[PDB]
Symmetry: D3
Amino acid sequence: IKAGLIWMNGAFVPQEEAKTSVLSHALHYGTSVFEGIRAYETAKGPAIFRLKEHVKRFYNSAKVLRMEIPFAPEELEEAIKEVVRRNGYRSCYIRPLAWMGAKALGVNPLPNNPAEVMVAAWEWKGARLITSSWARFPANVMPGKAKVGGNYVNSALAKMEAVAAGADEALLLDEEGYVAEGSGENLFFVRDGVIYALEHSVNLEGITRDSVIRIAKDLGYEVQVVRATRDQLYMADEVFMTGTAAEVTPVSMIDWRPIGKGTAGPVALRLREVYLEAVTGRRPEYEGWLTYVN
Amino acid sequence: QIKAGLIWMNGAFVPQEEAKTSVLSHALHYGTSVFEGIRAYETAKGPAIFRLKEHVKRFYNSAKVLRMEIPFAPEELEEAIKEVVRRNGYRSCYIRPLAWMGAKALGVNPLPNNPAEVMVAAWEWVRKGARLITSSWARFPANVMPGKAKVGGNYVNSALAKMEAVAAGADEALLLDEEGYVAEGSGENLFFVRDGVIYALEHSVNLEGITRDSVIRIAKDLGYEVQVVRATRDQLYMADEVFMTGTAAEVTPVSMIDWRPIGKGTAGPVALRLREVYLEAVTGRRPEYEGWLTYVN
Amino acid sequence: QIKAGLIWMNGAFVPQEEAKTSVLSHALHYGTSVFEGIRAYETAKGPAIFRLKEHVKRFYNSAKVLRMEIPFAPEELEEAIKEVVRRNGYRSCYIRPLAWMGAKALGVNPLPNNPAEVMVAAWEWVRKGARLITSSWARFPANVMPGKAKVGGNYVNSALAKMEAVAAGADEALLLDEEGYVAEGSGENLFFVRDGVIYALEHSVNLEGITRDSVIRIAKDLGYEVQVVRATRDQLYMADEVFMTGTAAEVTPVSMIDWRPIGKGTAGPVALRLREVYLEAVTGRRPEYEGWLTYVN
Amino acid sequence: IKAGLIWMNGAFVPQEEAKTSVLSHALHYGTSVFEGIRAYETAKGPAIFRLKEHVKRFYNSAKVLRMEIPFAPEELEEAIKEVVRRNGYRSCYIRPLAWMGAKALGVNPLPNNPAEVMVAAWEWKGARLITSSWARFPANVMPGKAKVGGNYVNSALAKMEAVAAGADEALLLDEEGYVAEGSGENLFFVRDGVIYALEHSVNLEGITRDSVIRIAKDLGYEVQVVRATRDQLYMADEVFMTGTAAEVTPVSMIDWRPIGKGTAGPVALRLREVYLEAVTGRRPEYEGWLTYVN
Amino acid sequence: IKAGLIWMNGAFVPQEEAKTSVLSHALHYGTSVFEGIRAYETAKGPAIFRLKEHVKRFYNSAKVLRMEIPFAPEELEEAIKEVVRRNGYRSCYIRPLAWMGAKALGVNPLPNNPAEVMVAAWEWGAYLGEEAVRKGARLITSSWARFPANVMPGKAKVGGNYVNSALAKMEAVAAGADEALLLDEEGYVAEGSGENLFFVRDGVIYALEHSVNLEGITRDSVIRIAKDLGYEVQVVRATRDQLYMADEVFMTGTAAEVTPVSMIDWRPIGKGTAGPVALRLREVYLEAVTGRRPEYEGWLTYVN
Amino acid sequence: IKAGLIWMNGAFVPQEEAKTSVLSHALHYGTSVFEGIRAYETAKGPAIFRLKEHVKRFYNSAKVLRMEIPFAPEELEEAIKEVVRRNGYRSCYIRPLAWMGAKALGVNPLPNNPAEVMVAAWEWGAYLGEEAVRKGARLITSSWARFPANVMPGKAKVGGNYVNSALAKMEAVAAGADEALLLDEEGYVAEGSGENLFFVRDGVIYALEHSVNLEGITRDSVIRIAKDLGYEVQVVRATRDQLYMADEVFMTGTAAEVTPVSMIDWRPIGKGTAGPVALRLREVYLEAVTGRRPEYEGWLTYVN
Ligand SMILES: *Cc1c(COP(=O)(O)O)cnc(C)c1O
Ligand SMILES: *Cc1c(COP(=O)(O)O)cnc(C)c1O
Ligand SMILES: *Cc1c(COP(=O)(O)O)cnc(C)c1O
Ligand SMILES: *Cc1c(COP(=O)(O)O)cnc(C)c1O
Ligand SMILES: *Cc1c(COP(=O)(O)O)cnc(C)c1O
Ligand SMILES: *Cc1c(COP(=O)(O)O)cnc(C)c1O
Ligand SMILES: NCC1(CC(=O)O)CCCCC1
Ligand SMILES: NCC1(CC(=O)O)CCCCC1
Ligand SMILES: NCC1(CC(=O)O)CCCCC1
Ligand SMILES: NCC1(CC(=O)O)CCCCC1
Ligand SMILES: NCC1(CC(=O)O)CCCCC1
Ligand SMILES: NCC1(CC(=O)O)CCCCC1
């Protein structure tokens, strides 16, 4: 990974120096939290998309683990802006990470507080999905509203499964059999002119999902939030997923069954395009979501 | 901090201070690591590692679950484990082998990161009984997290349950499965005794404990009838005895659950006998169980 | 027997006696068929089929779930459906389109049997309210059977619930989902009314009824507030009204569930108004709903 | 399908004449029951394997549907023997089927009794499995102890999924996440010399499974019955499945993870071979399971 | 409990006579239904909050158990007004109860119909001050799940149901918390041992769906009040961690009124104390029940 | 119910005095525990079946609710023997009961400790004849599931639990059946509204696993008896259709003894009448409880 200078607990250092004890609690028990934040190039230079909203979730994830982050939100935000500038990035993916150190290896993480923190970044047909044989964890098994390290063993298993089956991404159902979300994407589907966003259920409350719903509504679409089954998606006119890295990705096939016309549909493509216009500063109406680094 | 000393890092030992890895390591972000807990006990004939092969086999089995490739043959890992005891001059210690996905990429898919990085570290190492509290967090279903493997990510569930129990004033947490049945402790297999019979809980969503396996064999050799069953919280509440097993936990009696005393309210005779015979076995004082020991020197 | 008369068999009509298929047909052994329920009502301007396109669209959608190929374009099927009414001289009738996997092979995998065989048949076709009993059979979870499609196999579940209710002295069965919440009748979507508000049950594991959709539109046009929610059996027990919808069932008031009277214990005013407006709509007596009708002659 | 003469409600008729109304209840609602019975060639001619046991289950399946079979067990057995003789079969698969006719199309099948019956027959590396995203129905959703037509929509979905993913067969989990069985095979796994048969849970009580357990025990193996998870199979020394058509089939890989050595193992191969010896009349000890037609 | 005169099947009697056979079906099998109604003192005398709505539920709960209440709703309402008057109470908690008697002890309660009915009322010993309200309630998620909708009738106030509430409450208290937060069997948030839950996030007030919870009248009242004040209210299903990161969390109930929640599972909610929204809702709610809100007088039944 | 003299917290009193406050916690929240014990007449006087085992469970049920029973097990056992003697009973049903009193009415029952205790006993009005036994009981699977192990304490005889049993029993009766068969939330067979289930298939006797059911003493007794007679007994989890195709099905309970099941959900079991195994087990069981089986005298406690 070409990260370059990484912010390590207060100070930037060369990538090669950004290391941590192999006895770190997080490395053994998945006790870490992270975020996914993107910077896009605009006519006025790099702009970070919904920075504060992402940082807030970062601290929220930490609270779920009762993990203590030894920095104020403002400092992390400044670190995030600086990881872009110092590395001379224009368009990049920023990865803040807080993890429990190597003070002790009992399964209880509290003794390891405060958490160590770092911020790294690196320059940045229709998706085919397969329904995973791995269900997304119930809300009382793993904290699904938080981006906690350990949670992604579940995403990792589903992703490898999908790829091995010849698809691009996995669609996970909850333990009851209802659609949940992709290994790392929130789901949407369109039917008879109406855009359906799936309820939060056990899924993460996506910021891209949020942005897409606002944009859809601003464009005049009717948007409903519902619980959905796989066959509701099979027969939808369109299906698409959202996420910081994934942006707005159309889904043209699920479980080898074509969605609608079998290729990216007009609604998803339009939302994606307007979303890209929003993140690149071409829409005054969404300027409030941007934080120009320069 | 942890006083581990020399740590085996992918083929060679290095000072603990040098045993570090990139913060961009896949496992540090996604919980994609596997580990083991192995113990060496002091015996009249030097340190002896308890059931080393079974532990290493499970280490590789856990890796297979994540489709993780361990770039070392089992024999090499076993040697590294014996050497971590020697080189550090340990007599009694907890050994922690760990394999994790490195920093080649950060997509959720771990495969592009193979082979895994590997390290082995180690550090020198009842009457009243333990007090448990049933967690408000259920152990993950068999199709949510691989409960038969010691996969790093799995322990977020254990961590949450453990903090909860300690916060409530208990020693350890007792987790139920999503259906409401007893599963296991945050990191211990459960047993209970009623009317002379020893009940080992079914594997269900729990890890197939090696200590559990040992205590069952021992119990049968002592002449106890052992049954494997599914259990509810109130079946434990009215048990004569309840105890936990684990490499670190060994055999620990449980005297109270959810503020309800178990039997007499103190460690029971059955759990104590099992514990005593187990400690005799791991310390080379039981000829019939010598096959379970691997002498370091 | 059934008096269907001329039946459309894969492209052409034949006497009912000739409308037969191999007993080695995949669908006869594995439930691999899909079907629809469509009605034609008599109007001052001749027979009219209610929402023909929506029904045909669902027919194809159901086929997609089984990855079944229907060797006919929607337009041809729609024509066959109009012709089944004409050729038999029906004025009011129930139309049953059916596509099933033939007899090319009997491995559980249906794909080798594509394309599907297709046929369309039809046969000529409240106050006290219906009595329901909650079934001891739960409607299948969304990852067990495709509850959004009218797949033949799905109805073993419906058949079991229906026989049970009738045996218990009730008219129809009310099924719950595996979690314990109300799902739907053996073949009817459920609604309930409380304090002036009409509650349509969420789709959950139920079929997305076309009659349900019609009654919701009608209800809103009449000025009623309509909410879509999840419901428990006792929320129905204390409702002012409860009613069922389906192509065959139309709009049927429910006066009792599990021997517990609903509201006054007879059909309620809201269900009756919805029913009345629906029958006016399907009989061409509502200009605003003409788009839902397809006149045969 | 080359079936030849088919027994149709009391009398044999040419295949082409073995037809039923497209208005048959079973064709619309999956209300039928069937069996899978095999005949193997022996030195003394064709021998049907565990005939009576299969017929008993046939009638048992019917009781679950409250379906009335208008023939006595003895008659069906005679029909089954005759479908082999008359067609001059040596080794074949026999398929008895009872289905609800076209008397009425209400979802309730009772009015359609008695059921129509027929009996047809036709001459007869390690399997790679993938875990299905379709769970086998709970015991209060579909009658899993009976071979009821409608049940197989669930098997059909799982099978197509597996094949489409590049595997040979699907492994289904129950709704709780535990291993259930294949789309149409009971599961077994071996670990440290012990043979583990999965409990019945929501699975069909396989006759091949039964035979295999008896054989295993007769051979001296220790056999236990347990509930199992997918990772218990992932780490087993061996895994295999049973069924009339499948016989004893070794499983060398599940979800792209090799089982043991990655090829058919010694235990499964041995059980399979002894099973074939039993069904072909080479084992006096199992002669009781055979019914010679000639 | 100092109840004084208690209405027993049609007539008032001293508490000492308000007793029933220890062979009563309900004492052995939880076959009873009850209500929790409050009378708040006003300058015009005691006013009972939403009496008919509570009485309708009392009868609705009885229908679930197929229990027959041998009195017209109007008789019960009169009894409820009189228990207040006859005891000279001002503010007080009213507890109507209908239970299966001692005719027989088979599990089937039908042979025991009609049910016996009683209405008792008593005064409060103490009230939480504003300081305590502001500190907020501390919750702990219970290891006991609220019963699925096909196990126990969650929309009815059936006695047997409260064994579940009792287990969770004792658990929470033993853990050092004030109240328990129960999840449903699926892992989602249900309600307190006896309180409906709400949470506020980014300006929006979220009321939890009914799922397996009781359809609280205080919950209903709070929603109406919130909307009348201009707040946006949404009804959703929620997880424990959605509450952990909410700006505010609060619970409702006749006895609990509107109670701010400052911490759940040792994780502070928002600022760690009661927030402005819950406190504002509590105030308006109290102004409503004490007859100081003209727009809500329709909810009050003055005893005098 | 004609109980006569009833033991009330340490002393016997006429039934008429055996009453408790209608403000008792258990009457409002199902917070009670009870037992079902029988005394069978013998030529040596009444003999109580497995008294200590029943008493141990009574106390075990109390521990689940964290209910304090202010009497030593020995005192209760004496009370149980005396209720029989003092009423001059021969064969009779004994019902011990401990319930939370009227100290306070918050859901938490702890403030109400210690619990009140009573022991009542009464005679049977009628018994099933062999003809009825042979016809067998007809069951119907309930639409109510037995509570999961983390919702209601299924191993304890807690009053509140029986709301679930009551709902299922009424349902079965209304449907025209004799008893209800409940499944667990997962869809598997649990037990009757108050009876443990067994089924026989191809010579083997299958006792159902404990899962969420009560660990029946009659169930335990039947298993011991079956094995002593040479039958092979296996313990398994079962589905409704495994019972549909069983050779025989029967249920056990103190009141139900050993009852043959001839039909479930309108589907006949085996021959459609009681089978030889269940009838044989019932006979030996009855010979045991009536003191005609020397090998089982250890299970009997003679009152005189
Ligand atoms: C990060 C993530 C998402 C996407 O959320 P965004 O805020 O839109 O980036 C979706 N699902 C999971 C499981 C995630 O971790
Ligand atoms: C390691 C572990 C155990 C104990 O297993 P042993 O082989 O006996 O050390 C039990 N449960 C969990 C979750 C574990 O990780
Ligand atoms: C056909 C059917 C309905 C009714 O749907 P309509 O489109 O209104 O005819 C409801 N439930 C099930 C299970 C059905 O098969
Ligand atoms: C027929 C069948 C089997 C195999 O049973 P055998 O009696 O061994 O042929 C296994 N599973 C299912 C679902 C089946 O239908
Ligand atoms: C009584 C009760 C409430 C509160 O409802 P209100 O009508 O507002 O008094 C909430 N939950 C439960 C379980 C209750 O019994
Ligand atoms: C009392 C009871 C039984 C019977 O148990 P026995 O000890 O044999 O009397 C069975 N099920 C339930 C739910 C019970 O309460
Ligand atoms: N698809 C990717 C993410 C989400 C996203 O930003 O689309 C989830 C897994 C971990 C990496 C991020
Ligand atoms: N209680 C501890 C362990 C198990 C054990 O060895 O008892 C599980 C959590 C991770 C550390 C090990
Ligand atoms: N009640 C009937 C239907 C639905 C309907 O049209 O109301 C479902 C079962 C199959 C026949 C149709
Ligand atoms: N694999 C096949 C069967 C089972 C068997 O005989 O192995 C199940 C699906 C329907 C055809 C039979
Ligand atoms: N916390 C109390 C109640 C609710 C209430 O009024 O807040 C529920 C249990 C039964 C008594 C009432
Ligand atoms: N059928 C009755 C009992 C069991 C029995 O003794 O059979 C359970 C409910 C409570 C009374 C006892």
